Design a protein around this nucleic acid. Structure first.
Lengths: 48, 376, 79, 50, 99
DNA sequence: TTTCGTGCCAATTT
DNA sequence: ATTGGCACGAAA
């Protein structure tokens, strides 16, 4: 509903098709936070 | 002023060291005595605290009716009454060095007044005035049930009532010593120490004074079978309530005032501190008619008690004095106990909600709460 | 319609597992070609699934058994 | 209002991760529950505490 | 410090540095700025520091000094166990955010 | 040479 | 404004 770019489109397409299911995905604000923290000289990353 | 019972029931005394005086009544020589009203069914309905040196009209187990005075005492005056009956002799009692002579202008009934170390001369600084109870033969009368001789010391600002050579009995006063809301809940949950904390005892045994006015006063506790050389630093500017002639327990106060939850946790355990916190929070919430179950306060207290401090390394990798998670210590100890080894020993720590929430294992949550720069 | 779900909760035993089971059945009836086991009365798949659960016709074990039977039948008829 | 909000936010933060994750732990420890008596008045009976 | 009587972390002033140069010459090295701090961090050995601090901790008896030594030992151990290096706290390359 | 107090700084406030 | 940690200064 807020900030998953692919999830919004997939949910809208599924709703128009009568399939009430979602693929959650990853919020974009978390990626923005990761980039901002990396810009401070700190190595933060997701693993596995 | 005095305890006024409301209903009819039996009287019970808890932690009572009382003796019969000359007049036939009962006087309490124990600080932590509690008076309870238990009916025939066995359920307590009324509870009260009896101060040191109070006269009880009735005894333990006697039947009393409502609207009756069961105990009486002088609030402003602290009695220093004795237990044995005999003549009083003044030992280490010198005028002009430890005491003074002041005569009442109007009443005319007065005697020597014991001075304090902050006013008396230096020569009397090392001298402890005392009153000794003897018999007609001059020998020291040993207190029944004990072996040490019966002598009582006198602190400063003590007004001696009876002069030397006057016969006294049990219960007679030797000297007189003159004396909420949302922020409350916030302070309770943050475990903030009060401005004037209550001074407690760390170890049991007999108690005694030490070097006087060495910056601040000192206290010494000699256990019966413990570590004698233990000592404590206590300022003398606060009204003290310790009895140098009486044995004190670690669950006893020295001065008076609000008690810090950290001291309660350290000296009495987890149950005492959680009960104190729950009772205080419920007392605050009950005056407004709010009904809240105790489960929530209990889980909050549990979340506050999430840290432990190692007291010896033992077989584990934990160092001497690092603060760690309680659950990790429990897991390590239960793992080592199955290997035949010996686990480490720990002491629980109390943290405020703000401080406990900043010490979690996850740094994402801590950075989300507050103080992002330091946590990161 | 539906105003309460207490009977379905009593049948399943847990409110959190009831949601998952009902969602599974409703997705079977909606995306898939399954037909309801109760006479539908202008109801949606969620309410139909809840009514089926209340009657005792649908639970997690029944769904697992039906899925295993369908998979076995498909694998047998593939040849 | 602001103080109440700050207090409730701190309370949420300190206990957000506590979830019932087991059916029984097998412990024997507990707390003693007695009615709340202050002076000569009982403010909380034993029934509402247990 | 070299053969002179200057320690490894003594703070000098401009006149003091000029006098040291005119007396001792090039027998000592003195720097200012972040380069000096990076040089100090780069030439520090962690294992020897940890062991010396542990010896000083277990030998002497005190309260505040004991806590300070424990804190420094904890920081040194945190640096040692992880893959970080002390000189990485001085920036040489600066990241740039996406536009 | 250790130990407690006082001044300063950093954190917080729907 | 209020609270708590940290460096500093005076005293045992």
């Amino acid at each position: 509903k807020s900030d998953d770019v692919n999830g919004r489109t997939k949910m809208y397409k599924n709703i128009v098709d009568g399939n009430h299911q979602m693929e959650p995905g990853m919020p974009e604000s978390f990626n923005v936070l990761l980039k901002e923290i990396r810009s401070l000289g700190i190595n933060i990353e997701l693993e596995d | 002023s005095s305890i006024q019972v409301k209903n009819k029931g039996s009287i019970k005394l808890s932690n009572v060291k009382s003796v019969v005086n000359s007049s036939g009544k009962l006087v309490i020589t124990s600080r932590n005595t509690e008076l309870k009203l238990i009916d025939e069914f066995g359920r307590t309905k009324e509870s009260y605290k009896v101060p040191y040196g109070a006269v009880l009209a009735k005894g333990d187990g006697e039947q009393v009716a409502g609207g009756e005075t069961v105990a009486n005492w002088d609030p402003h005056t602290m009695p220093v009454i004795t237990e044995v009956s005999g003549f009083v002799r003044f030992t280490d009692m010198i005028d002009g060095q430890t005491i003074t002579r002041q005569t009442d202008e109007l009443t005319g009934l007065s005697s020597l007044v014991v001075l304090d170390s902050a006013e008396r001369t230096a020569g009397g600084k090392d001298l402890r005035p005392a009153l000794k109870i003897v018999d007609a033969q001059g020998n020291d009368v040993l207190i029944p049930g004990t072996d040490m001789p019966a002598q009582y010391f006198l602190p400063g600002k003590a007004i001696v009532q009876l002069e030397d050579g006057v016969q006294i009995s049990s219960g007679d006063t030797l000297a007189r010593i003159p004396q909420g809301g949302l922020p409350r809940v916030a302070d309770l949950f943050e475990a903030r120490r009060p401005k004037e904390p209550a001074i407690l005892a760390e170890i049991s045994g007999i108690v005694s004074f030490g070097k006087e006015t060495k910056g601040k006063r000192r206290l010494v506790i000699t256990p019966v079978d413990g570590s004698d050389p233990y000592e404590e630093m206590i300022p003398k500017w606060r009204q003290l309530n310790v009895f140098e002639g009486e044995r004190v327990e670690r669950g006893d106060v020295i001065s008076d005032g609000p008690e810090a939850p950290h001291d309660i946790l350290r000296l009495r355990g987890v149950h005492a501190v959680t009960r104190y916190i729950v009772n205080e929070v419920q007392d605050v919430y009950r005056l407004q008619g709010v009904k809240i179950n105790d489960k929530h306060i209990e889980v909050i207290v549990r979340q506050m008690l999430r840290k432990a401090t190692i007291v010896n390394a033992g077989s584990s990798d934990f160092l001497e004095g690092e603060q760690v998670e309680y659950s990790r210590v429990k897991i390590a100890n239960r793992e080592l106990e199955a290997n035949g080894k010996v686990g480490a020993t720990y002491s629980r720590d109390l943290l405020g909600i703000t401080k406990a929430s900043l010490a979690t294992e996850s740094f994402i949550s801590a950075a989300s709460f507050q103080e992002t720069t330091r946590v990161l | 319609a539906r105003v309460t779900v207490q009977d379905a909760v009593e049948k399943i035993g847990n409110r959190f597992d009831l949601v998952l089971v009902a969602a599974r059945r409703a997705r079977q009836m909606q995306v898939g070609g399954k037909d309801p086991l109760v006479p539908e009365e202008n109801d949606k798949t969620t309410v139909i699934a809840l009514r089926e659960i209340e009657e005792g016709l649908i639970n997690n074990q029944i769904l697992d058994v039906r899925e295993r039977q369908e998979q076995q039948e498909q694998e047998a008829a593939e040849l | 209002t602001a103080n109440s909000g700050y207090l409730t936010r701190r309370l949420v933060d300190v206990a957000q991760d506590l979830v019932v994750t087991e059916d029984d732990c097998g412990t024997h420890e507990g707390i003693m529950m007695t009615p709340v008596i202050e002076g000569g008045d009982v403010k909380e009976p034993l029934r509402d505490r247990v | 410090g070299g053969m002179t009587n200057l320690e490894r972390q003594q703070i000098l002033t401009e006149e003091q540095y000029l006098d040291a140069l005119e007396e001792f010459g090039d027998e000592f090295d003195a720097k200012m700025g972040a380069e000096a701090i990076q040089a100090l961090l780069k030439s520090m050995d962690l294992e020897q520091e940890c062991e010396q601090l542990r010896e000083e901790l277990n030998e002497t008896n005190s309260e505040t000094k004991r806590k300070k030594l424990t804190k420094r030992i904890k920081l040194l151990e945190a640096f040692v166990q992880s893959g970080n290096k002390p000189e990485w706290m001085i920036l040489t390359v600066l990241p740039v955010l996406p536009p």
